[model samples]
Target: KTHVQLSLPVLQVRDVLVRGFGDSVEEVLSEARQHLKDGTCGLVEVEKGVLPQLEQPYVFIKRSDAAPHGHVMVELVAELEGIQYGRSGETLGVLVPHVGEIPVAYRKVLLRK
Candidate 1:
């Protein structure tokens, strides 16, 4: 096992989805970030209006304790559907119900040839 650099982008909301106003989003992001810093788990729910098309939206934060010592893991749940997956470049992509495909981060060394 090897430790890799961990770098989380600040104010990166390009893929984050939550409920409430802009301020609420910021608050939730702060909480998630805090959880990562503390190596803990965090969860956020979507009441309504955030994604009208989807019935439910949720976000979960987890610590990447297995490897890459200081890493943050974020998971989004809409509804469990057919688990479709694939790969592109050096990243793995998985289908998130109604959220479409999202890239997963992994060390290049861990990838199979």
Candidate 2:
């Protein structure tokens, strides 16, 4: 039997927002990291997409500009399939659609101004 693996793209941060007393880049990055550490992260699930099978995990950070003391809205949206391999004479790949679980610390890349 051959080994099969499901390789997918890593999550990407579309936008980064820095709220509260400090509007510096450092503050934004600091808060963003903190949100991950804490369980205050938000989730944005996608109903549909162009390529449903290849939809990559995406994260968008949002916070109210009016109040710097407000909570940081770190929204993480991702969709994946629940895959299970079947064995016949040979290996068969079967993909079942289901909500994928998000890890506390997943691979993600971010870009900011």
Candidate 3:
């Protein structure tokens, strides 16, 4: 549709989301795995130490050939144990329905709803 604004403060661990510290996407993914293994919820360690307890944790970056330049997509994985989800009953990596965006820059996002 039009645009969706993700509340930055609602999902930050030490005021960070798209960390540029990691050289590879593997770094973030590994951090997520470690957090899960450590038996924590709603907390993502984009770096070391107690990142934070996010409102929604499980993070994923998505992009494609047709995506905008330098535009990073960070998706927070929905929880199954919380409330009833009307969407698909599958993994977060799959079954993505409506993808809305509001770019943080000009001359970057040409997508209009």
Off by over 4 Å in 2: 1-22, 43-113
Give the per-residue lDDT digits (tens) of candidate 1, residues 1-113.
13323332222123434322122333434443444344332122223443343222222222222332433332321122322122123111111111222323331212111
- Give per-residue lDDT, candidate 3, residue 82: 54
Overall local distance difference test of candidate 2: 0.26
TM-score of each: 0.23, 0.22, 0.23
Best by lDDT: 3
Candidate 1 — which pairs collide? none
By TM-score, how accurate is candidate 3? 0.23
- In model 2, the worst 10-residue window by lDDT is 87-96
**Separate clash counts for every candidate:** 0, 1, 1
lDDT tens per residue, model 2, 2-80: 2111222222122212112123334433543454444333232223441233222222332212211222212222222
Name the candidate, 1 or 2, with the larger TM-score value: 1
| Per-candidate RMSD, Å | 13.7, 19.2, 14.4
Report, for every candidate in turn, its global Cα lDDT versus the true structure.
0.27, 0.26, 0.29
